[PDB]
Amino acid sequence: FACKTANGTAIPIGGGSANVYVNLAPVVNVGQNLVVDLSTQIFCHNDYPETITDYVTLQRGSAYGGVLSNFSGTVKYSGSSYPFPTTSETPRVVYNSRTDKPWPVALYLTPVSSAGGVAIKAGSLIAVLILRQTNNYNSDDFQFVWNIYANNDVVVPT
């Protein structure tokens, strides 16, 4: 089991960590969502699907910088919705193919009432999402840690 990002980097067998940049709508009002869809960027696959079944959860989602201070959020993982930052590990998604399949995580962030001005800075760390991977074959229990960075400033109209 391993993961990579679209035109980007890879995390190899056994787990590890990688930095991911995201495009964000440059202006967002109170009552609107920033939708950060990671499923177009993070792709994983199973290395021996004929004999092994891989299990993948979102173990935790944390907020950082302007997201932590200026937004409230939910995370959508494989069709279900949860508070972001998260309160517990999600159920599992099955990976059973050598073919790249997306990691189905999306963040919906909405500006808090105190948010105003540049609420997220270009280049800043905004989130960490931890993918946890196990199987039906051995004791493997690995973490794939995704550091999420803002590509552009996001302004909350005052």
Of 3 and 126, which has the nearer Cβ to ligand FK9?
A: 3
Are the beta carbons of 19 and 54 closer than 8 angstroms?
A: no
Bridge partners (DSSP) listed for residue 16 = 144
Query: Which residue type, as a one-letter code, is found at position 13?
Result: I
Which residue, chain included where needed, has tokens 């004929």? 50
Q: Near ligand FK9 by CB under 6 A, which window of 22-30, 86-94, 117-125, 132-140? A: 132-140
Bridge partners (DSSP) listed for residue 64 = none
Of 96 and 151, which has the nearer Cβ to Ni ion?
A: 96
Are the beta carbons of 39 and 113 closer than 8 angstroms?
A: no
Distance (Å, whole) CA 25 – CA 59: 27
Instruction: Work out whether strand 54-63 and strand 80-84 pair parallel, antiparallel, or are unpaired.
Output: unpaired
Selection from ligand FK9, Ni ion, none that 100 binds (CB < 5 to 8 A by kind) is: none
Close Cβ partners of 52 (under 8 Å, ≥ 6 residues apart):
46, 135, 136, 137
The two tokens of residue 26 are: 């440059």
* Near ligand FK9 in 30-59, by CB under 6 A: 46-48, 51-52, 54
In the bound complex, what is the minimum distance in angstroms from residue 147's beta carbon to ligand FK9?
Answer: 21
Of 81 and 137, which has the nearer Cβ to Ni ion?
A: 137
Answer for which of 30, 35, 47, 100 binds Ni ion (CB under 5 A) is: 47
In the bound complex, what is the minimum distance in angstroms from residue 46's beta carbon to Ni ion?
Answer: 8
Instruction: Name the residues that contact Ni ion, by CB under 5 A.
Output: 47
Instruction: Name the residues that contact ligand FK9, by CB under 6 A.
Output: 1, 13, 46-48, 51-52, 54, 135, 137, 140
